[PDB]
Design an enzyme around this catalytic site. Structure first.
Site, PDB file in Angstrom:
ATOM      1  CD  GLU A 100      10.270   9.399   4.623  1.00 41.08           C
ATOM      2  OE1 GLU A 100       9.094   9.263   4.308  1.00 41.08           O
ATOM      3  OE2 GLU A 100      10.902   8.497   5.164  1.00 41.08           O
ATOM      4  CD  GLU A 130       5.812   8.862   1.772  1.00 39.99           C
ATOM      5  OE1 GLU A 130       6.620   9.134   2.668  1.00 39.99           O
ATOM      6  OE2 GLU A 130       5.617   7.686   1.446  1.00 39.99           O
ATOM      7  CG  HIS A 133       6.677   9.948   6.524  1.00 39.17           C
ATOM      8  ND1 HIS A 133       6.507   8.792   5.878  1.00 39.17           N
ATOM      9  CD2 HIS A 133       5.772  10.013   7.556  1.00 39.17           C
ATOM     10  CE1 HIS A 133       5.528   8.163   6.490  1.00 39.17           C
ATOM     11  NE2 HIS A 133       5.099   8.899   7.484  1.00 39.17           N
ATOM     12  CD  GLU A 195       5.946   3.516   0.460  1.00 38.55           C
ATOM     13  OE1 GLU A 195       5.093   3.088  -0.303  1.00 38.55           O
ATOM     14  OE2 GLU A 195       5.728   4.540   1.084  1.00 38.55           O
ATOM     15  CD  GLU A 229       6.338   3.505   4.933  1.00 42.94           C
ATOM     16  OE1 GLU A 229       7.063   4.270   5.567  1.00 42.94           O
ATOM     17  OE2 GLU A 229       5.906   3.802   3.826  1.00 42.94           O
ATOM     18  CG  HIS A 232       2.796   4.856   2.834  1.00 41.79           C
ATOM     19  ND1 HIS A 232       3.851   5.626   3.102  1.00 41.79           N
ATOM     20  CD2 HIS A 232       1.684   5.503   3.298  1.00 41.79           C
ATOM     21  CE1 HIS A 232       3.435   6.704   3.694  1.00 41.79           C
ATOM     22  NE2 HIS A 232       2.137   6.610   3.799  1.00 41.79           N
TER      23      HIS A 232
HETATM   24 FE   LIG Z   1       7.638   7.963   4.148  1.00 42.18          FE
HETATM   25 FE   LIG Z   2       5.967   5.433   2.695  1.00 36.70          FE
END
Ligand SMILES: [Fe+3]
Ligand SMILES: [Fe+3]
Ligand SMILES: [Fe+3]
Ligand SMILES: [Fe+3]
Lengths: 512, 384, 162, 512, 384
Positions: A100, A130, A133, A195, A229, A232
């Site tokens: 992260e 991030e 996270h 990811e 996510e 991402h």
């Molecule tokens: Fe993350």
């Molecule tokens: Fe991510």
């Protein structure tokens, strides 16, 4: 009224003009070395504006905390978790935490790379995500230290992780892998493979295995990470779209993709199988089944197939990765348990139901792994007065443990049931050890990228307890080790029990 | 249905059978070893300090050994070589407002939703009826509009810092400092988009402000300095310091506070002040962080104070000259304003407010000798 | 029968429909509150429906008062054309001069049966409530537990069935 | 820039000037009849302004919802609750709701009464707190209707309420007693007795029975309701401080307090005890112990003792309340169960383990109540093919059920192990039934305050199922009743099952 | 320790065995019988409608029979007799915005914590340096300061309606309309308390604003209208209608929007606009509830529209004269401003904005024949 209420607020109305925000000047170019040109006019999928991003996440947060702080604390949820999963979550949360955190730096690099204002904006949302996270994974260790059955290791993993070998490989895939190299190589490591192939599946799977083992803290947090996510993975897709019309992609994209895939799977195939099967008590599904669904079918088949029109192919190493999948996690836990004094988490031998489960799902597990665990138990590996640490059995039965130089995964070629090929070379007064043809090519082609000192090089000639004492692998009584060869609250090993062993590290390569 | 170990009588019984009689360690404080800035630790510190895996060879790091994968050629994932400043400990910085990700998105979400309620109020109340037309369709549309690109530029100046910052606390401060700069740029556009809904024929397109930013003269040297601070500085501390303790502290504070905040009220505009109160709240928040890092940690560093102050003085001189040019060219805008809006005595006093605040808050802090009368005279040379 | 819908309610809706003038509507409403309202009502025959029937009678009188009166009279006069402030001041002087709690309750009840909105403007009537209620309570709550139940039953004039 | 950041205009800095916000003008007086004069310099204890009030509550909300919405929904906490307690919460939540709601209007009246700005301001914060609390009790029924095992009654209790005799009593203590008749008498029913004696102990006690019986929703809500209640107790205390120097208090205050105490305890002594002991499977402690601690020791002893210096004494009806207390709740459940078709909830007979528990705590319970429930069971009271409702037993054994005229509590004086008082008076062509002499005195002195038509007077001559049909006492399907004489999921009762019995209401008073 | 039925194996095993196989009813709504204003039932409506236990003899009630305890004398707990208005159903009203205490205190909390951040930004930025001292120490301290008592009296005019309102939805709107008025009164005092901290010698005491309110000529007629609306009206609807659709719609709007919000920017005051932005957002949020209740529900009622429009016309006519007198006296304040701030052409224009906004939003809804020119001429009689 005097007119009526409007607003613009809605991020879409303002986002429509983002993209025109960037202007041309000579030197509006990326500060990072790269083989590729990201197109300007690359559009992004989510019409976010900063203020609306904040609102979107704040709503998720208040539900997440709120559950954590009221209901789950009233139910004593931090305490009522199987001891094995309490230990697995020290690794799972602190190691995910580094990924992260390095994904922050990584999409700072990708925001710099991108020339389109929308694509820059896509990676900006992920910079911020991030950071969320990072503080979420830290908050899982925060809460279990505060309220759980064994805070040691949950409370200091940022410094006790440095004692052991599995930390080095985590740093290769989820720290250095994310930030050191061409920005697109970093992007394939992070977004395309990291990811989409492993983090997005894992965060949801961890939640199931958590729920079975009594943990309702990690579902509260990780199910909120997972709602982010998808933006991402939209960013990774967009990295490919932005570079697909450049001549350089047809020369270079599938090699950076293959090296990135190998990188990530090399650590994750054995480590994630090991934490799922050996770190739980209640088992959800065998890892052999899971890996195949995740890697081969969902990513390798569907996700990568969506990109074939941009010239992406499935990594040429997918086949090699599937032939070392079946045994690799079993292979690894033998070494992780044998090296239990250098972790920051407590570990347990398989009990008889688990061995029955392992043998039903992996025909032949017992004759190999099962019999060694039984011999270690009989020698007394769980008891401090035995004077036995399983490393001793590797030495007295001449089974060298090598560290790869590229991925940093430990392997023991003389014992391993997996695809284990030792390659050893001396270059300019130094010996290097490799475990496979892909990592070997990476080092041979790029030696100055891969200069990491391994556990035996750094600790050579040092007695084990002075390493542990120096790197603070001790509970607050300054005597009992964080890290134990059993998960029971009685007969915990102390620094003196380790000092008795007189175990001194040697570099395995000095025998060649 | 899925059986859960917390509520399922069989699974829970097994779990409970395994638990210890009391916690295996009484130390339940997750960052117990950090060294608190404020006596009792704080959740912002426990959740943030030491998330960066730096080895001891980057000052303050707790890990050991090299990086596992470096750049082609050998450049480290993070290294001492990416900035000129040096310190005893890169993890020493603390954001005074203790902002980790949840309180930062909470405050901004609040601001967002009250922005939505305030605009619904403002248009329902019909308050544009008292706003001066000239101010609205020219200064607001074009010159405030044009300033968006200066704030976007400053936002982008943060990209390299976001990748190169040498600790967790410096990374999180930098990132929040940059995200507030793009927020202000998007608020400039939101305001023009709002006026396009409320004022018939007002055009929200960015073409007119963009043409003002790229080809007009009032912003020429502003754009040249932003272009250089963003794409010509490769040192992440040189960008952060020079954007925040030299350029934005002088030109940005003059334009935002002493031009548009000071004159939009005079034309019956309470709309642009609503968005500038945000911009000025964010500037004052980031200031406390930038002074903590540059002056309290770096400038006052126990081993490196003299060195760091030498380097920061060098950069203040490097970037004070293009910042004066930015101001000097912006002085041309007052000629475009209706006569008697302001006078030379008021413009001079507002310039002295910006310079004296900068000396107080930033220049005096590293012992940079600034001559207040010389800076204001150089700037005033561009006034009529 | 029916709680909420029944023949008794239907019969009264039908006769309330047909009151075509204010003076007749208000006569009916006043007479209705003497006959079916308070413990001093003339019979308990409509006990289950009188509150609802009364509301319907009020609607009609309110509508007719509003059509018949000008704006100042709507504010200041009763439906019978009396000056509301005069009636209110006279009733308060009456109440204030009440010899005991027995006298006081009959003045305060009686006022409500006669003058409840839409007969009196509510601004005047709730000011009546305010003043009238204070004196009735001061008289009733003084030495509240001192008369034995056997004596209080007799003062109220109850027939002891037990 | 120039100068330090203050906001430092916190709520106290503004509150310091709040008392001067009111100004004198001839008609600045209460609009409500009262015997007392509240002093104009009364101070309040919590220094709040509107904005800070709102912040202070919004923070409690985030925790509260958030637990309900993430973790409690995912643990499926709405369903894993004992049958019995799910039905108890239809009553406890919806009947607490009417108290919450009428308390809004009660403190509206009190804000109008107080002349001191700060006294008005403390009542104002209660105004808003009781709005908060109405939506919180509503939310609990909402969550249980949406996610529980039986939504009927949880989903419509604002109109199915209206069919039964217990609702009428609730309206007397927590609707009408809060807002009708001298603002100070109302304040004594709401604040000095209602909250200080009954609601504020009740709210934590409900969370303790809720959690024993598997309910984790009610704890989440009622424990945040409880964080507001001290401010409301401080308001009751300031009501007495504000009138304590007026000569009117020496004449009137202890009579209004005695009346308020008897009002509130007449309904809550039998009702709360019955809800706790007969509405639960798992018991926390017997009601006799609890009633004695809450009413005699905590309130009567310590709370009221604090106000002795204001000339407040313990209510003269306290010893009568204690002698009538012991069997009161047992006597009422016989009746609530006999009339089970009139409710909006499902009732169960005592099982063998709790008959043993009642016996152990209430010597004599079995030879009276246990024997009667066993007879009713033998007659098939829970089986619809039986053609028996326990009300038929009262009629055949000649035990009339009467409804007080003042408190609205049903009593059967010929069967009761508790009080046996029955007074019937005729006045102006109407008969009135009383069950104690405090309430008989209130009717005799104040007849026009107490004219509430009771269930037998309204339903006289009507057949049971026609009342139930008319008042929507049915489940969707238009057949099964919401009310049931057992808590099992099969052999539920139906409208035609009640209709076959041709049970027609009779006014008991028509036998005199 | 303390065993809980959800997680304890033995207890949960007992609860789980007693459960049915599926819900005993499939209708898991709550409020399913309420007629939704907007096609799908909202959470606002489910948690609010029919919480008030009214019997069928107060229009729209679902219960039956008399109240169990009435006032001494017989007055009912809620009755039709407490207001002149009549309707088919008192539960018809919906707050457009749908506020049920949790969204409402959520929004206000955002406003409190953003006020705090704004203030810390403003004082640290030093923006008072550009504010005119005569405006600051006189017009903010004394004249804005005095308006506090007008908002507090309008807040207080809500006490009785809080006790007397005839349904849940009207009472929750009424309460939120009154709480916003005490909030404004508290924000005018918060502004004076901020100013005392940043400006040496500013006295935050309410003695001077209070004297102005009680003994000055400008707010005389306003205070007498407030004293009347608060304590001389005993009909709860007459209070809320006359406060919100007559008095505050003309006078309050003039003062807030057309005097202080228009003229404070001309004196370098961006502070007072921050608080009047809250006051105008609240004015407009309340207006929507006021219009739904009085025009859509009462004014357009299927049985009583003509009746209720006649009584509301009556109350508009009754309170328009005190309102015009309040406006008239307030014109005396312009004579106190520094010369050159405003002229009669701007004032006449601002008056017509207030009068025409009121005719459109309020008077026209009930066919009240108002004549704009005579209302502004009447007010203009107090300007010099
Ligand atoms: Fe993350
Ligand atoms: Fe991510
Ligand atoms: Fe409450
Ligand atoms: Fe309360």
């Amino acid at each position: 009224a005097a007119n009526r209420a409007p607003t613009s607020v809605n991020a879409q109305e303002v986002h429509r003009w983002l993209q025109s925000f960037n202007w041309d000047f000579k030197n509006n170019r990326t500060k990072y070395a790269t083989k590729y040109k990201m197109a300007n006019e690359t559009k992004e999928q989510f019409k976010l504006i900063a203020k609306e991003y904040a609102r979107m996440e704040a709503v998720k947060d208040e539900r997440q905390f709120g559950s954590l702080q009221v209901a789950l604390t009233r139910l004593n949820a931090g305490v009522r978790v199987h001891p094995k999963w309490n230990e697995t979550m020290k690794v799972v949360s602190n190691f995910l935490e580094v990924g992260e955190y390095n994904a922050i730096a990584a999409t700072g690099m990708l925001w710099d790379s991108a020339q389109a204002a929308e694509q820059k904006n896509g990676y900006l949302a992920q910079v911020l995500d991030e950071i969320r996270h990072t503080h979420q994974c830290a908050y899982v260790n925060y809460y279990f230290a505060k309220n759980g059955q064994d805070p040691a290791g949950h409370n200091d993993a940022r410094r006790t992780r440095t004692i052991g070998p599995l930390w080095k490989g985590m740093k290769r895939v989820f720290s250095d892998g994310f930030i050191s190299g061409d920005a697109v190589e970093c992007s394939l490591n992070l977004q395309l493979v990291g990811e989409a192939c492993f983090t997005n599946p894992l965060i949801v799977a961890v939640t199931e295995w958590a729920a079975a083992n009594g943990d309702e803290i990690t579902p509260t947090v990780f199910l909120s990470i997972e709602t982010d996510e998808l933006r991402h993975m939209a960013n990774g897709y967009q990295t490919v779209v932005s570079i697909a019309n450049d001549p350089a992609s047809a020369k270079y994209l599938n090699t950076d993709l293959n090296n990135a895939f190998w990188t990530q799977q090399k650590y994750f195939t054995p480590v994630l199988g090991m934490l799922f099967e050996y770190g739980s008590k209640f088992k959800v599904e065998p890892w052999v089944k899971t890996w195949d669904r995740w890697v081969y079918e969902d990513w390798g088949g569907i996700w990568i197939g969506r990109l074939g029109k941009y010239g992406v192919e499935s990594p040429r190493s997918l086949k090699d990765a599937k032939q070392d999948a079946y045994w690799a996690h079993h292979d690894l836990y033998l070494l992780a348990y044998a090296l239990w004094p250098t972790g920051f988490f407590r570990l347990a031998l398989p009990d008889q139901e688990e061995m029955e489960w392992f043998e039903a799902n992996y025909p032949g597990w017992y004759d190999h792994y099962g019999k060694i665990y039984e011999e270690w138990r009989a020698r007394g590996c769980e008891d401090p007065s035995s004077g036995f640490i399983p490393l001793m059995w590797f030495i007295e039965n001449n089974h060298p443990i090598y560290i790869d130089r590229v991925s940093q995964v430990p392997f023991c070629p003389s014992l391993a049931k997996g695809a284990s090929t030792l390659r050893v070379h001396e270059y300019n007064g130094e010996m290097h050890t490799f475990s496979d043809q892909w990592g070997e090519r990476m080092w041979l082609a790029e030696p100055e990228r891969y200069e990491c000192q391994n556990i035996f090089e750094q600790y050579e000639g040092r007695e084990l307890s002075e390493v542990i004492a120096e790197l603070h692998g001790l509970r607050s009584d300054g005597k009992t080790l964080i890290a134990q060869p059993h998960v029971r609250g009685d007969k915990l090993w102390t620094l003196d029990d380790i000092k008795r062993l007189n175990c001194v590290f040697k570099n395995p390569v000095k025998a060649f | 249905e899925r059986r859960r170990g917390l509520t399922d009588p069989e699974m829970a019984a097994v779990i409970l059978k395994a638990l210890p009689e009391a916690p295996l360690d009484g130390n339940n404080k997750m960052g117990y070893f950090v060294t608190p800035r404020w006596k009792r630790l704080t959740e912002y510190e426990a959740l943030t300090v030491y998330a960066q895996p730096n080895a001891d060879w980057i000052a303050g790091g707790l890990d050991w050994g090299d990086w596992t994968q470096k750049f082609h050629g050998g450049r480290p994932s993070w290294g001492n070589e990416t900035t000129e400043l040096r310190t005893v400990d890169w993890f020493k910085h603390r954001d005074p407002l203790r902002r980790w990700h949840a309180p930062y998105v909470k405050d901004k979400a609040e601001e967002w939703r009250y922005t939505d309620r305030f605009l619904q109020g403002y248009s329902a109340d019909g308050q544009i009826r008292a706003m001066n037309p000239t101010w609205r369709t020219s200064s607001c549309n074009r010159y405030w509009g044009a300033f968006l690109f200066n704030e976007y530029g400053l936002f982008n100046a943060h990209s390299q810092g976001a990748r190169e910052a040498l600790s967790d606390v410096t990374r999180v401060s930098l990132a929040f400092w940059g995200f507030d700069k793009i927020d202000i740029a998007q608020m400039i556009q939101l305001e023009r988009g709002f006026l396009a809904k409320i004022v018939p024929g007002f055009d929200e397109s960015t073409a007119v402000p963009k043409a003002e930013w790229t080809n007009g003269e009032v912003y020429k040297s502003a754009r040249l300095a932003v272009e250089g601070l963003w794409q010509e500085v490769f040192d992440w501390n040189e960008s952060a310091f020079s954007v925040h303790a030299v350029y934005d502290a002088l030109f940005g504070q003059f334009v935002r506070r002493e031009f548009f905040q000071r004159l939009a009220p005079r034309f019956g505009d309470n709309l642009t002040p609503f968005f500038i109160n945000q911009a000025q709240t964010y500037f004052q928040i980031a200031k406390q962080g930038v002074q903590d890092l540059y002056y309290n940690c770096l400038g006052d560093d126990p081993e490196f104070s003299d060195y760091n102050r030498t380097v920061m003085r060098n950069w203040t001189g490097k970037w004070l000259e293009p910042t004066i040019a930015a101001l000097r060219d912006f002085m041309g805008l007052f000629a475009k304003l209706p006569a008697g809006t302001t006078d030379k005595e008021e413009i001079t006093a507002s310039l002295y407010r910006v310079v004296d605040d900068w000396i107080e808050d930033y220049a005096s802090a590293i012992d940079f000798k600034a001559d207040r009368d010389q800076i204001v005279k150089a700037v005033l040379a561009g006034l009529k | 029968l029916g709680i909420h819908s029944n023949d008794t309610r239907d019969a009264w809706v039908n006769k309330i429909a047909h009151v075509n003038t204010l003076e007749k509507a208000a006569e009916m409403l006043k007479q209705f509150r003497m006959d079916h309202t308070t413990p001093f009502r003339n019979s308990y025959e409509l006990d289950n429906d009188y509150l609802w029937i009364e509301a319907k009678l009020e609607e009609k009188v309110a509508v007719l008062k509003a059509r018949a009166f000008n704006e100042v009279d709507f504010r200041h006069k009763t439906a019978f054309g009396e000056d509301a402030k005069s009636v209110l001041d006279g009733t308060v002087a009456k109440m204030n001069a009440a010899k005991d709690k027995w006298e006081a309750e009959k003045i305060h009840i009686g006022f409500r049966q006669a003058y409840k909105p839409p007969i009196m403007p509510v601004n005047y009537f709730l000011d009546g409530e305010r003043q009238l209620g204070t004196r009735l309570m001061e008289l009733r709550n003084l030495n509240y537990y001192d008369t034995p139940l056997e004596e209080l039953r007799k003062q109220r004039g109850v027939r002891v069935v037990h």
